[PDB]
UniProtKB/Swiss-Prot annotation:
Keywords: Acetylation, ATP-binding, Cell membrane, Chaperone, Cytoplasm, Host-virus interaction, Hydrolase, Membrane, Mitochondrion, Nucleotide-binding, Nucleus, Phosphoprotein, S-nitrosylation, Stress response, Ubl conjugation. ISGylated. This is Heat shock protein HSP 90-alpha. It is found in: Nucleus; Cytoplasm; Melanosome; Cell membrane. Belongs to the heat shock protein 90 family. Homodimer. Identified in NR3C1/GCR steroid receptor-chaperone complexes formed at least by NR3C1, HSP90AA1 and a variety of proteins containing TPR repeats such as FKBP4, FKBP5, PPID, PPP5C or STIP1. Forms a complex containing HSP90AA1, TSC1 and TSC2; TSC1 is required to recruit TCS2 to the complex. The closed form interacts (via the middle domain and TPR repeat-binding motif) with co-chaperone TSC1 (via C-terminus). Interacts with TOM34. Interacts with TERT; the interaction, together with PTGES3, is required for correct assembly and stabilization of the TERT holoenzyme complex. (Microbial infection) Interacts with herpes simplex virus 1 protein US11; this interaction inhibits TBK1-induced interferon production. The lineage of its organism: Eukaryota, Metazoa, Chordata, Craniata, Vertebrata.
Length: 209
């Protein structure tokens, strides 16, 4: 059972801007996704401060980076608060309509794409490097769901029958053919140290056989 949705016109416009604009500093996608994971971890920590049972779905608060050269995927896993089905449909929990509006005025007033995270729509920078993005997520108040889009104006949502997560979000980046540098260990390490050296959660870079 797969439901297909249309992006709001402004989000579709943001995505094709990210896809079609010439912009060489593509590595900022990883900074934005790690920063999104840090925000989600902050939220479940804050809720656990007054209600410890919110961590019954998992006590560890961390971020894992898993490259896979065979599948040509880079996966960012976090054990944050996760997303409900309604959040996934509502632009993955963001205020993307007003965020895109403020982002695109800032661009024509002298900003560049790397500032996308300041407008709340940093997730869509994933399409700087990925032809297709899959988001697996589990929130305490909902079941596990899978969001997917290759851009082109539409996305899908389905109940995920895959590996149970417990709680959190998994962003799977199916990388473009000319962007496999972001699967190499030393390149990921360089980006993490450059842009995310102060994130307050352990970032584990997985290695391959
Ligand atoms: O070292 C460089 C660097 C630049 C900017 C942020 C850095 O770490 C953090 C800290 C808190 C939240 C997110 N990222 C690190």
């Amino acid at each position: 059972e797969v439901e297909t949705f249309a992006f709001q016109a402004e989000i579709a416009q943001l995505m094709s801007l990210i896809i079609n604009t010439f912009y060489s500093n593509k590595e900022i996608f990883l900074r934005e996704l790690i920063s999104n994971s840090s925000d989600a971890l902050d939220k479940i920590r804050y809720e656990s401060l007054t209600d410890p049972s919110k961590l019954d779905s998992g006590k560890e608060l961390h971020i894992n980076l898993i490259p896979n050269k065979q599948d040509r995927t880079l996966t960012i896993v976090d054990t944050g608060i996760g997303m409900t089905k309604a959040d996934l449909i509502n632009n993955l929990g963001t205020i993307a309509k007003s965020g895109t509006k403020a982002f695109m005025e800032a661009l024509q007033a002298g900003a560049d794409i790397s500032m996308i995270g300041q407008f709340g729509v940093g997730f869509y920078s994933a399409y700087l490097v990925a032809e297709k993005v899959t988001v697996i997520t589990k929130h305490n108040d909902d079941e596990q769901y899978a969001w997917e889009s290759s851009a082109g104006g539409s996305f899908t949502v389905r109940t995920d029958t895959g590996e149970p997560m417990g709680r959190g979000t998994k962003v799977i980046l199916h990388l473009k053919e000319d962007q496999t540098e972001y699967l190499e260990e030393r390149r990921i390490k360089e980006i993490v140290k450059k842009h995310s050296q102060f994130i307050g959660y352990p970032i584990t870079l997985f290695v391959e056989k």
